[PDB]
Design an enzyme around this catalytic site. Sequence first.
Site, PDB file in Angstrom:
ATOM      1  CG  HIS A  41      -0.549   0.420   2.458  1.00  0.00           C
ATOM      2  ND1 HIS A  41      -0.214  -0.505   3.421  1.00  0.00           N
ATOM      3  CD2 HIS A  41      -0.324   1.639   3.011  1.00  0.00           C
ATOM      4  CE1 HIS A  41       0.205   0.128   4.505  1.00  0.00           C
ATOM      5  NE2 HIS A  41       0.126   1.429   4.287  1.00  0.00           N
ATOM      6  CG  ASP A  88      -0.025  -3.921   2.841  1.00  0.00           C
ATOM      7  OD1 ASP A  88       0.494  -3.509   1.794  1.00  0.00           O
ATOM      8  OD2 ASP A  88      -0.388  -3.163   3.759  1.00  0.00           O
ATOM      9  CB  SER A 170       2.432   2.843   5.797  1.00  0.00           C
ATOM     10  OG  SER A 170       1.093   3.198   6.131  1.00  0.00           O
ATOM     11  N   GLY A 171       4.638   0.279   6.355  1.00  0.00           N
ATOM     12  CA  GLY A 171       5.809  -0.385   5.777  1.00  0.00           C
ATOM     13  C   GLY A 171       6.925  -0.666   6.765  1.00  0.00           C
TER      14      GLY A 171
END
Length: 215
Positions: A41, A88, A170-171
């Site tokens: 994402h 993801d 995120s990530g």
Amino acid sequence: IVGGRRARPHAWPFMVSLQLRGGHFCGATLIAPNFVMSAAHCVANVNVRAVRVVLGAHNLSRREPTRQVFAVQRIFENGYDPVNLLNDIVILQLNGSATINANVQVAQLPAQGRRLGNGVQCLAMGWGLLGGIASVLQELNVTVVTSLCRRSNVCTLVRGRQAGVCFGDSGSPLVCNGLIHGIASFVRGGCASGLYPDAFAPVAQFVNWIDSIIQ
Ligand SMILES: CN1CC2=C(C(=O)N1)[C@@H](c1ccc(C#N)cc1)NC(=O)N2c1cccc(C(F)(F)F)c1
Ligand SMILES: *[C@@H]1O[C@H](CO[C@@H]2O[C@@H](C)[C@@H](O)[C@@H](O)[C@@H]2O)[C@@H](O)[C@H](O)[C@H]1NC(C)=O
Ligand SMILES: *[C@@H]1O[C@H](CO[C@@H]2O[C@@H](C)[C@@H](O)[C@@H](O)[C@@H]2O)[C@@H](O)[C@H](O)[C@H]1NC(C)=O
């Protein structure tokens, strides 16, 4: 990271900042000298040729000689499904290899299919929103949970207060017993609800696939 703390500088030298025009947008983990891993994402709808991969950073608001900056050569994906919140994970091949030093190390991954039990103690981290957005790398103690979590995630919850990952995290890696078991994927109820656990991509589910790419 909401309700976390400043990391010791360079304590997590596998920790990566993904940037566009000098600004952080996502975390990542150095998994080999020429590969990082992040959330799928993070790079959906992004100009990946514009992406700068920043290794060895601590304070993003600062000029840092410890930093090594790369471009993205190739991307590898594994069936990312945004609708169902599945897979993801993305691997970004760098245009050169990192210089492994005090400030820049390759992470250790778990064995394939290794599942984490309710109550495992982990460290979440990142340069995401603080509740401002962080200059200094944050870390936070989180506990693995199975309630309000699907089997396609590792989920974590801070009990007794409202804290967890947030936008810009995120990530980023989730470190559990010294291994990268998570890649921060999604929140529910806003950041730090004190109700919904944070969901991570389950790295252990993808280890054979990761290995195949990096060798
Ligand atoms: C804005 N950004 C973050 C984001 C979504 C998105 O699409 N983009 C979006 C999203 C959609 C699908 C998949 C899948 N599979 C993963 C994330 N939902 C979402 O909750 N975040 C978000 C917000 C705060 C923190 C985090 C994180 F640190 F936990 F990762 C993620
Ligand atoms: C690999 O790329 C590094 C950074 O390149 C810069 O960032 C990318 C995203 C583009 O914006 C590009 O125009 C910039 O130059 C270089 O510093 C490094 O030398 C490269 N390594 C190589 C070619 O071996
Ligand atoms: C807070 O976390 C501290 C550091 O976590 C430990 O080391 C990292 C690298 C991960 O491997 C994580 O799984 C380990 O637990 C701990 O030293 C400390 O005990 C923690 N405190 C509480 C109460 O959670």
